[PDB]
Design an enzyme around this catalytic site. Structure first.
Site, PDB file in Angstrom:
ATOM      1  N   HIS C 201     -24.315  19.495  12.707  1.00  0.00           N
ATOM      2  CA  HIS C 201     -24.816  20.810  12.315  1.00  0.00           C
ATOM      3  C   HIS C 201     -23.830  21.934  12.621  1.00  0.00           C
ATOM      4  O   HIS C 201     -23.870  22.978  11.961  1.00  0.00           O
ATOM      5  CB  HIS C 201     -26.157  21.077  12.986  1.00  0.00           C
ATOM      6  CG  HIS C 201     -27.282  20.296  12.390  1.00  0.00           C
ATOM      7  ND1 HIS C 201     -28.600  20.504  12.733  1.00  0.00           N
ATOM      8  CD2 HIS C 201     -27.286  19.316  11.458  1.00  0.00           C
ATOM      9  CE1 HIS C 201     -29.366  19.677  12.045  1.00  0.00           C
ATOM     10  NE2 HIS C 201     -28.593  18.946  11.263  1.00  0.00           N
ATOM     11  N   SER C 205     -22.817  19.926   6.314  1.00  0.00           N
ATOM     12  CA  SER C 205     -22.568  18.695   5.585  1.00  0.00           C
ATOM     13  C   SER C 205     -21.418  18.869   4.599  1.00  0.00           C
ATOM     14  O   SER C 205     -21.080  19.977   4.178  1.00  0.00           O
ATOM     15  CB  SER C 205     -23.826  18.245   4.847  1.00  0.00           C
ATOM     16  OG  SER C 205     -24.736  17.646   5.747  1.00  0.00           O
ATOM     17  N   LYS C 227     -36.452  15.755  -1.644  1.00  0.00           N
ATOM     18  CA  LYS C 227     -35.485  14.765  -2.112  1.00  0.00           C
ATOM     19  C   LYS C 227     -35.430  13.561  -1.179  1.00  0.00           C
ATOM     20  O   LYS C 227     -35.441  12.410  -1.633  1.00  0.00           O
ATOM     21  CB  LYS C 227     -34.105  15.403  -2.254  1.00  0.00           C
ATOM     22  CG  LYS C 227     -33.017  14.429  -2.657  1.00  0.00           C
ATOM     23  CD  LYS C 227     -31.907  15.135  -3.411  1.00  0.00           C
ATOM     24  CE  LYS C 227     -30.945  14.144  -4.036  1.00  0.00           C
ATOM     25  NZ  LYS C 227     -29.543  14.381  -3.596  1.00  0.00           N
ATOM     26  N   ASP C 228     -35.391  13.803   0.132  1.00  0.00           N
ATOM     27  CA  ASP C 228     -35.411  12.704   1.088  1.00  0.00           C
ATOM     28  C   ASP C 228     -36.759  12.004   1.100  1.00  0.00           C
ATOM     29  O   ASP C 228     -36.835  10.812   1.402  1.00  0.00           O
ATOM     30  CB  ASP C 228     -35.058  13.213   2.480  1.00  0.00           C
ATOM     31  CG  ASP C 228     -33.674  13.806   2.544  1.00  0.00           C
ATOM     32  OD1 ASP C 228     -33.211  14.356   1.524  1.00  0.00           O
ATOM     33  OD2 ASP C 228     -33.032  13.693   3.605  1.00  0.00           O
ATOM     34  N   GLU C 271     -27.045 -13.844  10.537  1.00  0.00           N
ATOM     35  CA  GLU C 271     -27.692 -13.184   9.421  1.00  0.00           C
ATOM     36  C   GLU C 271     -26.639 -12.614   8.477  1.00  0.00           C
ATOM     37  O   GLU C 271     -25.447 -12.555   8.792  1.00  0.00           O
ATOM     38  CB  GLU C 271     -28.638 -12.088   9.907  1.00  0.00           C
ATOM     39  CG  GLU C 271     -30.138 -12.432   9.857  1.00  0.00           C
ATOM     40  CD  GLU C 271     -30.640 -13.084   8.558  1.00  0.00           C
ATOM     41  OE1 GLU C 271     -29.889 -13.230   7.570  1.00  0.00           O
ATOM     42  OE2 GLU C 271     -31.828 -13.468   8.531  1.00  0.00           O
TER      43      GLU C 271
HETATM   44  C1  HEM Z   1     -28.123   5.032  13.643  1.00  0.00           C
HETATM   45  C2  HEM Z   1     -27.838   5.189  12.356  1.00  0.00           C
HETATM   46  C3  HEM Z   1     -27.466   6.513  11.842  1.00  0.00           C
HETATM   47  C4  HEM Z   1     -28.283   7.582  11.668  1.00  0.00           C
HETATM   48  C5  HEM Z   1     -29.755   7.647  11.968  1.00  0.00           C
HETATM   49  C6  HEM Z   1     -27.487   8.634  11.156  1.00  0.00           C
HETATM   50  C7  HEM Z   1     -28.033   9.881  10.852  1.00  0.00           C
HETATM   51  C8  HEM Z   1     -27.344  10.768  10.059  1.00  0.00           C
HETATM   52  C9  HEM Z   1     -27.937  11.739   9.238  1.00  0.00           C
HETATM   53  C10 HEM Z   1     -29.412  11.995   9.100  1.00  0.00           C
HETATM   54  C11 HEM Z   1     -26.941  12.402   8.605  1.00  0.00           C
HETATM   55  C12 HEM Z   1     -27.114  13.537   7.634  1.00  0.00           C
HETATM   56  C13 HEM Z   1     -27.413  12.982   6.242  1.00  0.00           C
HETATM   57  C14 HEM Z   1     -26.172  12.342   5.685  1.00  0.00           C
HETATM   58  O1  HEM Z   1     -25.167  13.046   5.442  1.00  0.00           O
HETATM   59  O2  HEM Z   1     -26.141  11.113   5.467  1.00  0.00           O
HETATM   60  C15 HEM Z   1     -25.724  11.839   9.025  1.00  0.00           C
HETATM   61  C16 HEM Z   1     -24.493  12.260   8.593  1.00  0.00           C
HETATM   62  C17 HEM Z   1     -23.348  11.540   8.894  1.00  0.00           C
HETATM   63  N1  HEM Z   1     -23.233  10.387   9.562  1.00  0.00           N
HETATM   64 FE1  HEM Z   1     -24.653   9.413  10.273  1.00  0.00          FE
HETATM   65  N2  HEM Z   1     -26.222   8.227  11.009  1.00  0.00           N
HETATM   66  C18 HEM Z   1     -26.123   6.949  11.405  1.00  0.00           C
HETATM   67  C19 HEM Z   1     -25.015   6.107  11.436  1.00  0.00           C
HETATM   68  C20 HEM Z   1     -23.743   6.547  11.115  1.00  0.00           C
HETATM   69  C21 HEM Z   1     -22.596   5.746  11.065  1.00  0.00           C
HETATM   70  C22 HEM Z   1     -22.525   4.271  11.348  1.00  0.00           C
HETATM   71  C23 HEM Z   1     -21.542   6.559  10.708  1.00  0.00           C
HETATM   72  C24 HEM Z   1     -20.141   6.148  10.531  1.00  0.00           C
HETATM   73  C25 HEM Z   1     -19.425   5.722  11.563  1.00  0.00           C
HETATM   74  C26 HEM Z   1     -22.062   7.868  10.541  1.00  0.00           C
HETATM   75  C27 HEM Z   1     -21.323   8.961  10.179  1.00  0.00           C
HETATM   76  C28 HEM Z   1     -21.932  10.072   9.606  1.00  0.00           C
HETATM   77  C29 HEM Z   1     -21.149  11.100   8.921  1.00  0.00           C
HETATM   78  C30 HEM Z   1     -19.654  11.125   8.751  1.00  0.00           C
HETATM   79  C31 HEM Z   1     -22.026  12.013   8.485  1.00  0.00           C
HETATM   80  C32 HEM Z   1     -21.718  13.268   7.719  1.00  0.00           C
HETATM   81  C33 HEM Z   1     -21.770  12.951   6.226  1.00  0.00           C
HETATM   82  C34 HEM Z   1     -21.585  14.216   5.436  1.00  0.00           C
HETATM   83  O3  HEM Z   1     -21.602  15.323   6.016  1.00  0.00           O
HETATM   84  O4  HEM Z   1     -21.419  14.161   4.198  1.00  0.00           O
HETATM   85  N3  HEM Z   1     -23.405   7.826  10.785  1.00  0.00           N
HETATM   86  N4  HEM Z   1     -25.986  10.826   9.910  1.00  0.00           N
END
Ligand code: HEM
Ligand SMILES: CCCCCCCCCCCCCCCCCC(=O)OC[C@H](COP(=O)([O-])OCC(O)COP(=O)([O-])OC[C@@H](COC(=O)CCCCCCCCCCCCCCCCC)OC(=O)CCCCCCCCCCCCCCCCC)OC(=O)CCCCCCCCCCCCCCCCC
Ligand SMILES: CCCCCCCCCCCCCCCCCC(=O)OC[C@H](COP(=O)([O-])OCC[N+](C)(C)C)OC(=O)CCCCCCCCCCCCCCCCC
Ligand SMILES: CCCCCCCCCCCCCCCCCC(=O)OC[C@H](COP(=O)([O-])OCC[N+](C)(C)C)OC(=O)CCCCCCCCCCCCCCCCC
Ligand SMILES: CCCCCCCCCCCCCCCCCC(=O)OC[C@H](COP(=O)(O)OCCN)OC(=O)CCCCCCCCCCCCCCCCC
Ligand SMILES: CCCCCCCCCCCCCCCCCC(=O)OC[C@H](COP(=O)(O)OCCN)OC(=O)CCCCCCCCCCCCCCCCC
Ligand SMILES: CCCCCCCCCCCCCCCCCC(=O)OC[C@H](COP(=O)(O)OCCN)OC(=O)CCCCCCCCCCCCCCCCC
Ligand SMILES: CCCCCCCCCCCCCCCCCC(=O)OC[C@H](COP(=O)(O)OCCN)OC(=O)CCCCCCCCCCCCCCCCC
Ligand code: HEM
Lengths: 52, 445, 379, 98, 31, 56
Positions: C201, C205, C227-228, C271
């Protein structure tokens, strides 16, 4: 990064921090030996080898 | 003509001494003007609690009247020749210097002899002067730098004569009568602790014979036997906070015990100080200033003006910084400023040491410009050092210091030493003394 | 008077989180998976609790207990298979999220990327420990093999594997420890996900185009909440299809057999989501080399911000990089297919080539392609 | 020839389709943000309008008609004169720290 | 910085035209 | 003073402080364990297994 950090002042800073960093590493080594109770090392220091 | 060649020229500081003990020192270069004054070794540090402020009274009443010159006739003679007579009194030295032409030297020395030997100390003029000093205290109350420095000395050298203010508490000034002042004059204005310094179109032989024919009556006998002795002081690492939230800015000065006058470590430490440097809001250097703290302050508009000092008395002195900034900037600077010192205590570089050496050389050379600063140098150096250090010696000592020397001396004086913080004004964010003392050492090291 | 949403500290945090958070208006559907992960996590936790309320953690009564969940507990099979298939959905969303981060250059947000890598590590660890709990043949032998891998660590390997085993093999002690860690770990994942969102935040994004979207921003609430919600409904549709129609589609039948330590399955495989790394370790002959390649296969995501060399953050305007990325994805699917297959010619050669090509694309082909890319645009 | 492949890649890049000028697509690191701040007002306003319109188009997943695409020879390099100066200043600072 | 005596006010009546001065290392000064 | 020498020989540097603490703990563990075990055995002399292994 590959050249910005390669400088005479940076090399001098490295020399300045060599004693501190090196004996910090010694601190870590001795702490690891003490924590794990490493017999292979502690068997040589006197009065501590009596524990085993 | 290179720097070294010009440094040698440096017309000498020929020094002599009469039978009484009044050292006569002159410095002839070219000018038709000359600065002549005596540097007595009086000051606040030689004043006890009951009579503190006597020196300020004596300095005030010096020019008002003399026995030989009835009064304003002194001022008439001084102005009729164009001389700018002036005086000052620090915690250690008190000096009077006639600043006039070379041709008026015979009369100028005579005027100084009258002021420093035959002072009327008239009770009526004492009473009129009493109100003025009280007014001057109300003047200095407004000046925030002066009061914060007085707080510095009060909280650092507490319990010693050095902590006393030079002007004196506004209770002694209302009780100091002729008797106390006369004792001060007859017990501190003694020939051995006097330096008749002149600079400019002045001849050493002329100064010597004028001194012989005028200051001969000066005596070195200390009444029955009362000889005021120099008393070592005790730097007491403490803190004081006069919090007044109505003030616009928050003057904060923090210092540790530096060296004395004679200690050679003064030369390296100043270089270290020159590395931190000094900044004011109206500089224009801005983000590109070489000093790390100056660039940080200018980039983020942290402070309004910070500067480092090297207050140095005989056996001890203060060494640190004084910064004036807004309310939500005091802590950050006390993080960055200390962050500099520890870095200087652990990671001094050749480049910044060379920069500090150049800054120190330039400061020493520039300050010694004009007859009056040269007279100041002679008068102060004959008392603090016992001799006038030539510029060549300063250059040699500066060339001696390097990165290793700076690191060693800073670790000796700065690293893990209790400071003497002294704040004023809207000092809320001012870190607690434990926080400051913690910041006085670095856990990485 | 103050608005409670913007004044109450709890409602203030919620408001800044997903009510008035300035989000780009052009983020594609691929961002929804983020929320899906959280949604999946929440669902998982719920189901996990309702599984922990009828599951003993003893070797003698582990497997039978699970059957008692499926055969006796009112609406128990639904919870059990909901957990089993929600794990697969969680990993599908995780992989798609990692792919989205790779593609649109979201790894440039360094702290969020590293926190995501930590979350990935924790999620795979949690899922592996969970698969052991039913105490089927596959669970027992997979745990045995995986922990035996740690014996390759120099000096402190055998002690470490014996310690984790709580003995000299996978047994009651190991099962109970695995149950306890499987219970606690998802809460650590929740905390880490909160930290992930916190770090995200402070920068906002990233849009698909890569360019800063500060000029074109919309409130999160009226648009992205719904949307979500739609994305969550579609993921629920897919997950419910899996649970209700082919519950054991992504499940080895050998798991429905008591864990007998005196008889190995003819084929032993993890798996599906663990195959991509598994085949990688199969490629390297050396035992310690297998472990190092296994850890590198995931830790290489750390080097993504440093290996980036293209002047543009995203990949919408880099066709050659796009072909490279899809080559990498196809290679990952190749490794996944190979891992399940038994080790035998030609799968040995194909697996070795797939692993080599994966590392080559990640470290060499992508930065070189980006450097070539810059020259074609006069920069 | 080299310019032929450059033009082919310009066509295949895709940001010409959204009316996006080349420098609009650059990543925004500290040097790039400082360069954008240094832009004159007219150039900044045009840049922000182009970026906003492109963001709209990508949100609705459409591209402008064939006629209103930025061509190869109409793709001026407006950020480059400031970006090169910013890079030179940064390199000078590092060389002084060197 | 106030003044309520002749001695403090002495020397405050300018008799020469104002000359502004600002440096790069030295603070701004007027006279 | 001995304390002053100890300080400005082995306490000023926080890293030297850590090394001193590490070695001090290394020796203190052995010393404290030996002393406490000896005291505890002294209190219950003849009532522990180690005092009656010789008989059997
Ligand atoms: C426990 C599982 C995870 C949860 C619950 C989680 C949660 C979130 C959420 C809700 C967002 C904002 C929505 C989105 O842009 O997709 C986000 C953004 C992001 N997450 Fe995760 N995430 C997880 C795992 C990961 C993993 C494995 C990575 C990569 C190593 C990661 C990297 C990022 C990045 C780079 C963003 C920003 C994407 C953007 O701004 O376009 N996350 N995460
Ligand atoms: C007819 C034969 C051709 C079918 C389309 C084939 C194809 O590659 O379409 C790409 C095409 C998008 O191509 P693009 O504009 O380069 O990428 C935009 C993003 O995918 C973002 O586009 P979006 O925001 O419209 O979301 C689309 C997204 C929606 O799905 C997801 O986000 C989840 C995908 C995994 C499940 O699905 C995909 O991006 C993958 C393709 C899905 C199947 C088609 O797919 C669609 O427009 C959606 C078609 C949906 C079914 C009708
Ligand atoms: C790595 C640091 C040393 C760890 C270690 O094995 O220390 C020796 C000590 C005791 O061993 P030791 O000192 O009796 O001799 C080494 C014995 N092997 C080779 C089996 C390890 O190790 C432990 O107590 C735990 C080892 C794992 C620590 C993580
Ligand atoms: C729940 C936990 C149990 C219940 C609470 C009580 C916990 C134990 C008591 C409190 C212990 C606090 C830590 C010990 C004191 C301390 O180090 O204070 C920090 C003190 C506070 O400042 P200081 O001024 O005392 O020390 C630093 C300054 N010099 C270096 C000049 C002495 O800082 C340090 O000690 C810094 C160096 C730490 C080195 C540690 C080495 C460890 C090596 C083995 C691993
Ligand atoms: C229920 C606790 C949180 C706060 C920790 C202290 C602050 C911190 O993280 O400092 C990092 C340190 C400070 O660096 P400094 O340059 O002094 O200040 C920042 C601006 N440059 O920046 C550093 O680079 C220091 C990194 C740590 C070095 C430790 C060395 C000794 C141990 C090995
Ligand atoms: C979780 C995210 C959603 C909830 C938090 C954010 C929304 C605001 C707080 C909840 C809410 O809807 O409150 C409604 C109302 C607020 O008070 P009201 O006087 O209506 O408006 C001015 C002060 N906000 O507060 C009320 O209590 C209204 C009366 C009760 C409901 C009918
Ligand atoms: C899937 C098939 C559809 C697909 O992805 O088509 C490509 C499309 C490209 O979309 P766009 O970036 O707008 O194209 C610009 C072209 N100048 O869309 C994309 O490129 C978006 C999909 C790739 C990035 C999102 C994450 C998913 C990546 C594939 C699976 C990841 C997991 C396995 C690999 C790691
Ligand atoms: C990480 C911990 C496990 C290391 C791997 C391993 O194999 O450890 C072996 C051993 C475990 O305990 P063990 O000696 O088997 O117990 C015998 C019955 N009491 O390990 C040990 O006994 C000690 C292993 C070292 C870690 C614990 C002791 C130090 C803790 C930190 C102290 C400083 C703070
Ligand atoms: C991070 C989210 C989680 C994932 C990915 C996950 C994954 C898994 C997997 C793959 C299984 C094996 C299912 C099977 O073989 O049939 C499983 C079983 C289990 N999980 Fe979880 N789990 C998660 C959260 C939880 C939580 C929070 C709990 C505790 C409240 C829990 C308790 C259990 C129990 C008791 C079992 C044994 C029942 C069974 O195997 O069907 N899980 N988990």
């Amino acid at each position: 990064m590959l050249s910005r950090f390669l400088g005479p002042r940076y090399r001098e800073l490295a020399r300045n921090w060599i004693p501190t960093a090196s004996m910090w590493g010694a601190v870590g080594a001795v702490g690891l030996v003490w924590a794990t109770d490493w017999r292979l090392i502690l068997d040589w220091v006197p009065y501590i080898n009596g524990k085993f | 003509a290179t720097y070294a060649q010009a440094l040698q020229s440096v017309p000498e500081t020929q020094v002599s001494q009469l039978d009484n003990g009044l050292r006569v020192a002159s410095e002839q270069s070219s000018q038709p003007t000359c600065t002549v004054g005596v540097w007595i070794d009086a000051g606040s540090r030689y004043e006890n609690e009951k009579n503190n402020g006597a020196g300020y009274f004596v300095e005030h009443l010096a020019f008002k009247g003399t026995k030989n010159r009835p009064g304003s006739a002194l001022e008439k003679e001084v102005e009729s020749m164009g001389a700018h007579l002036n005086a000052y009194s620090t915690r250690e030295h008190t000096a009077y210097y006639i600043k006039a032409l070379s041709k008026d030297l015979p009369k100028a020395v005579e005027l100084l002899a009258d002021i420093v030997q035959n002072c009327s100390l008239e009770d009526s003029q004492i009473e009129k002067e009493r109100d003025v000093i009280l007014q001057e205290l109300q003047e200095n109350d407004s000046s925030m730098r002066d009061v914060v420095f007085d707080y510095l000395h009060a909280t650092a050298f507490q319990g010693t004569p050095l902590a006393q203010s030079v002007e004196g508490p506004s209770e002694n000034v209302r009780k100091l009568s002729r008797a106390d002042l006369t004792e001060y004059v007859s017990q501190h204005y003694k020939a051995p602790r006097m330096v008749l310094a002149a600079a400019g179109g002045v001849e050493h032989r002329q100064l010597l014979d004028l001194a012989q024919k005028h200051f001969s009556s000066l005596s070195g006998t200390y009444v029955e036997d009362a000889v005021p002795a120099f008393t070592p002081c005790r730097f007491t690492g403490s803190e004081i906070r006069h919090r007044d939230d109505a003030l616009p800015l928050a003057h904060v000065a923090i210092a540790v015990e530096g060296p004395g006058w004679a200690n050679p470590d003064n030369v390296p430490l100043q270089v270290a100080n020159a590395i931190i440097g000094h900044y004011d809001s109206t500089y224009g250097g801005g983000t590109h200033m070489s000093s790390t703290l100056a660039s940080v302050a200018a980039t983020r508009k942290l402070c309004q003006s910070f500067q480092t000092f090297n207050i140095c008395y005989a056996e001890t002195g203060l060494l640190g910084a004084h910064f004036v900034c807004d309310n939500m900037s005091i802590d950050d600077m006390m993080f960055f400023l200390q962050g500099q010192w520890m870095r200087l205590c652990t990671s001094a570089t050749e480049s910044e040491v060379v920069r500090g050496k150049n800054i120190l050389r330039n400061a020493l050379v520039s300050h010694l410009d004009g007859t009056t600063p040269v007279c100041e140098d002679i008068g102060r150096s004959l008392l603090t050092y016992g001799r006038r250090i030539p510029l060549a010696e300063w250059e040699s000592r500066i060339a001696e210091v390097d990165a290793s020397v700076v690191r060693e001396v800073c670790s000796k004086y700065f690293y893990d030493q209790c400071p003497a913080v002294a704040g004023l004004g809207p000092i809320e964010q001012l870190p607690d003394y434990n926080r400051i003392r913690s910041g006085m050492f670095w856990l990485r090291f | 008077m103050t608005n409670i949403r913007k004044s109450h500290p709890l409602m203030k945090i919620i408001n800044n989180a997903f009510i008035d958070l300035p989000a780009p208006s052009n983020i594609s559907s691929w961002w929804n998976f983020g929320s899906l992960l959280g949604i999946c996590l929440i669902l998982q936790i719920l189901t996990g609790l309702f599984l922990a309320m009828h599951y003993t953690s003893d070797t003698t009564t582990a497997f039978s207990s699970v059957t008692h969940i499926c055969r006796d507990v009112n609406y128990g099979w639904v919870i059990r298979y909901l957990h089993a298939n929600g794990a697969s959905m969680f990993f599908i969303c995780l992989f798609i999220h990692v792919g989205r981060g790779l593609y649109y250059g979201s790894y440039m947000f360094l702290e969020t990327w590293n926190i995501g890598v930590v979350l990935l590590f924790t999620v795979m660890a949690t899922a592996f420990m969970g698969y052991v709990l039913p105490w089927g043949q596959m669970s027992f032998w997979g745990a045995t093999v995986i922990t035996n891998l740690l014996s390759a660590i120099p000096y402190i390997g055998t002690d470490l594997v014996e310690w984790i085993w709580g003995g000299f093999s996978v047994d009651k002690a190991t099962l109970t420890r695995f149950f306890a860690f499987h219970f606690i770990l998802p809460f650590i994942i929740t905390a880490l996900a909160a930290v992930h969102l916190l770090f995200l935040h402070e920068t906002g994004s990233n849009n698909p185009t890569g360019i800063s979207s500060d000029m074109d921003k919309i409130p999160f609430h009226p648009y992205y909440t719904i949307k979500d919600i739609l994305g969550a409904l579609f993921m629920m549709l897919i997950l419910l299809i899996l649970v209700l129609f082919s519950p054991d589609l992504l499940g080895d039948p050998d798991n429905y057999t008591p864990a007998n330590p005196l008889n190995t399955p003819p084929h032993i495989k993890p798996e599906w989501y663990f195959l991509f790394a598994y085949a990688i370790l199969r490629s390297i002959p050396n035992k310690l080399g297998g472990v190092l390649a296994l850890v590198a296969s995931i830790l290489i995501l750390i080097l993504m911000p440093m290996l980036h060399t293209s002047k543009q953050r995203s990949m919408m305007f880099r066709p050659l990089s796009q072909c490279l990325f899809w080559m990498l994805v196809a290679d990952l699917i190749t490794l996944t297919w190979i891992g399940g297959q038994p080790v035998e010619h030609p799968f040995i050669i194909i697996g070795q080539l797939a692993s080599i090509l994966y590392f080559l694309i990640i470290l060499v082909l992508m930065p070189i392609t980006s450097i070539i890319e810059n020259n074609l645009l006069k920069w | 020839w080299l310019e032929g492949i450059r033009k082919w890649y310009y066509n295949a890049a895709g940001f010409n389709k959204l009316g996006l000028m080349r420098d609009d697509t650059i990543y925004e690191d500290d040097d790039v943000k400082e360069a954008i701040r240094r832009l004159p007002e007219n150039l900044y306003n045009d840049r922000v309008f182009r970026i906003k319109r492109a963001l709209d188009l990508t949100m609705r997943q459409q591209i402008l008609p064939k006629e209103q695409w930025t061509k190869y020879e109409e793709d001026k390099f407006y950020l480059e004169p400031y970006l090169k100066e910013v890079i030179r200043e940064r390199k000078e600072r590092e060389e002084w720290a060197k | 910085r106030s003044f309520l005596c002749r001695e403090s006010l002495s020397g405050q009546a300018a008799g020469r035209p104002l000359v502004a001065s600002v440096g790069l290392n030295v603070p701004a000064s007027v006279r | 003073t001995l304390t002053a020498r100890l300080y400005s020989l082995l306490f000023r540097r926080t890293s030297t402080f850590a090394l001193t603490i590490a070695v001090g703990a290394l020796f203190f563990e052995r010393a404290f364990d030996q002393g406490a075990d000896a005291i505890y055995e002294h209190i219950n002399q003849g009532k522990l297994w180690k005092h009656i292994k010789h008989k059997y």
